Ligand binder design. Structure first.
Ligand code: CAO
Ligand code: CAO
Lengths: 427, 427
């Protein structure tokens, strides 16, 4: 049936990294109970609201398939309720500051005593043992810490953050691997473990290819697939020439190919007024005859100045600028269809508007309309992994404290005790 | 212990997306057998080599903890060997182009018949059922299809690819989630499933916050925290003011926060000569009093135009221009310290040079020195999830076909048939 049916998750998370992890677990069938601050809740509820006093799309897109209980954990009665909840949980997830759970009385040691089967999973800024262990970090600071910012953007501009959530959502997906790995250990040992993912580390994992580059640069002095290896192409803001003679750390390479074959971002019709009217166009080394046919340069097929990767190093940017002239009168999609006829990896820059209403992504369940009769329906991203014998059923995000009484009832508390906790401001 | 100890992985993968998945399963204890083409093998072997006739760092950094066998699969005797290997495998992983494995005769349907416990795990460019289902896709093509390029970069520049591998390794890590979720399904049903991750979809999942923004924009006409909603700050190509008039798709926001918590990328001493001499500075609403102390401006505490997120939406870039001047004679690390005292999320742009040789990252096993006695040692990224009861043991990447006979003997074949496979040009 569903992979995580019958898995109970005690979810202390807030913001993005932690909640992305537990939401996706929820999508795969987990029973996720979200513990929130009494009164305000997860701060995404109030961040960037489109309607005042309605939970923001920030909250709803990260907290589907979850229930909510308000709990003040700084009270002693709040701690005893947590212990009951820990004893019934298979995994606890937290992305609080570095030592916050510990300060609350719940160290890994004490959790093991309460439930020797439970898995404790956390997101942190930096790994335990790191000099910067104790630092609070959000999305973009993590991108900077893990090498993405340094290697994203242009040689003549600043380190640039990625629009993708490399620090936070990525950390949450990384933690999901850790939790699932820990569930596989537990099948063998009958015991829970602690797993942790540092945001710096989740970022650095995606930037593996740039650590390849750093070593290539140290060993050889050149990165031949980068624009700066073309003589007299790249310049700094004062017009000084940029070459690998003077580069000792992997530079920004604009829209160069990364771990793909060489490529560039080429303008299509309307690029002046439409910010997303571009394609990415790849010059794979085994496809030069095809490219030559497409752009009507038969003379470039047998010329060694043009027909190997090595021959193209000194002129690759000129070749891209010439290919680009062939797209001046065609939109993204026509250029993509044209290239497809040749088998050339090439695709449009899809705008968020285009993605939000794309039939294909709705059909395959990647962009999903959530039914929310309280707030109005909204779109979210569903499960990016598609299975032959299981479909996710995405349900709306909880109102703050919506399930508090319902959850306290599942723990076995009589109606009178639930009454008292409301009065003492515990729940 | 070792999470995937005893899990047998038949690994057809090549390039980045698939190999990152299987390598990481290998780090967690899985037994990974990499099937490669005779003669050339995985295309990363020969891709941007730093030494002639030595496996490239592209290959070594993505194929540690794996054994290698060469196989001609377009041969009848090769197809028979695969059948036998499929009978002994828990998961097959593949990232050939659309229909490639099917064309070899190994459809999901036939695979089930051969071993009803096996998991088939696949990376493609686009999801099955998508209009672009049949297209071949590298790294940056997926960044473009999944919305990242459209939303990364500056408002007066092109769509920009991330240096991080959003398309390839990111898909690989999502596929790992999918595979481990199928192993959990299998504990219940006794049966294998097919799992697939589309590169477009793995990208989209990390761009969830931008689909939030797209809906905020459709509903309200504005994104108040984006540079373009700041009065007379952003300008287009021509000397011309930008605003959310006529913006209907989420625009590029340079180095803006991307969420509920504003930030920017600020220069530090050395920025003209050092591409990575910068910090990122987040302005968390709840830490606004803490910020006013370090900035040496006590006036902003009581001012209602400066003490709330709402009051700050029209002079965000004025505050950042000012905070930047107090960094002009301190390096990255000095500025990061000068904060930190105050608990401020602010950190340095780390260069690849700094990360490759950083003591902390090597202490925690995130950057790892691989002992490779054939090729010379190299660095790699280790496991980004850290466990209380388990340490990865990373071992060197295999030579092409280094383990062919070893693997052919584990299948129960004799010495003399191993010879005739060599002579018939199948192994
Ligand atoms: C997000 C953040 C950077 C900043 O968080 P913050 O605004 O400083 O809050 P915090 O540090 O998590 O929590 C403050 C305290 O309140 C407490 N708290 C949280 N929820 C509580 C509740 N319901 N009841 C009582 N106390 C609670 C915590 O115990 C914490 O401990 P201390 O007072 O002893 O320091 C930090 O939580 C963090 O570093 N998290 C890890 C990184 C991460 O996962 N970020 C993801 C999203 S990034 O875009
Ligand atoms: C990456 C890539 C674009 C490369 O494309 P390509 O170089 O043209 O290779 P391919 O299309 O995968 O394989 C070519 C053929 O050789 C075959 N092949 C592969 N290994 C073989 C072997 N050992 N013996 C015989 N044939 C083999 C395939 O069956 C395929 O056969 P067809 O003629 O029936 O299509 C493509 O594999 C792809 O789209 N993969 C899926 C998406 C992906 O993961 N890309 C990420 C790469 S990381 O950026």
């Amino acid at each position: 049936t569903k992979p995580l049916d019958g898995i109970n998750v005690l979810d202390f998370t807030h913001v993005q990294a932690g909640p992305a992890c537990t939401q996706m677990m929820g999508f795969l069938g987990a029973n996720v109970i979200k513990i929130e601050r009494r009164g305000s809740g997860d701060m995404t509820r109030g961040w960037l609201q489109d309607k005042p006093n309605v939970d923001s799309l920030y909250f709803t897109m990260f907290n589907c398939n979850k229930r909510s209980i308000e709990l003040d954990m700084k009270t002693p009665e709040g701690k005893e309720l947590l212990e009951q909840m820990i004893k019934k949980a298979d995994v606890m997830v937290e992305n609080f500051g570095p030592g916050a759970l510990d300060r609350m009385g719940f160290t890994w040691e004490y959790i093991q005593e309460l439930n020797p089967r439970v898995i404790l999973a956390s997101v942190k800024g930096y790994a335990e043992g790191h000099a910067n262990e104790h630092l609070k970090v959000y999305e973009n600071v993590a991108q900077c810490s893990g090498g993405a910012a340094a290697t994203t953007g242009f040689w003549d501009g600043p380190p640039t953050v990625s629009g993708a959530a490399l620090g936070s959502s990525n950390s949450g997906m990384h933690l999901m691997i850790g939790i699932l790995a820990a569930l596989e250990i537990r099948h063998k040992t009958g015991r829970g473990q602690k797993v942790a993912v540092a945001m710096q580390d989740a970022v650095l994992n995606l930037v593996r290819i740039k650590l390849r580059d750093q070593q290539r640069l140290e060993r050889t002095g050149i990165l031949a697939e980068y624009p700066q290896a073309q003589p007299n192409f790249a310049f700094d803001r004062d017009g000084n020439p940029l070459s690998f003679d003077n580069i000792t750390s992997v530079p920004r390479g604009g829209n160069a190919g990364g771990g793909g074959q060489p490529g560039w971002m080429l303008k299509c019709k309307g690029w002046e007024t439409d910010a997303d009217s571009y394609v990415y166009f790849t010059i794979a080394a085994n496809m030069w005859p095809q490219i030559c046919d497409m752009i009507d340069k038969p003379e470039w097929k047998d010329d060694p100045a043009y027909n190997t990767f090595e021959g193209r190093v000194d002129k690759l940017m000129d070749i891209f600028s010439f290919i680009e002239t062939k797209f001046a009168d065609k939109d993204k999609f026509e250029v993509t269809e044209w290239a497809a006829q040749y088998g050339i990896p090439c695709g449009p820059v899809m705008s968020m508007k285009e993605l939000a209403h794309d039939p294909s992504l709705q059909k395959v369940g990647t962009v999903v309309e959530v039914v929310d009769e309280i707030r109005g329906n909204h779109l979210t991203v569903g499960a990016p992994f598609k299975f032959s014998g299981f479909q996710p059923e995405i349900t709306r995000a909880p109102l703050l404290g919506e399930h508090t009484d319902e959850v306290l009832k599942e723990l076995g508390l009589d109606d009178a005790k639930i009454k008292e906790l409301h009065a003492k401001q515990v729940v």
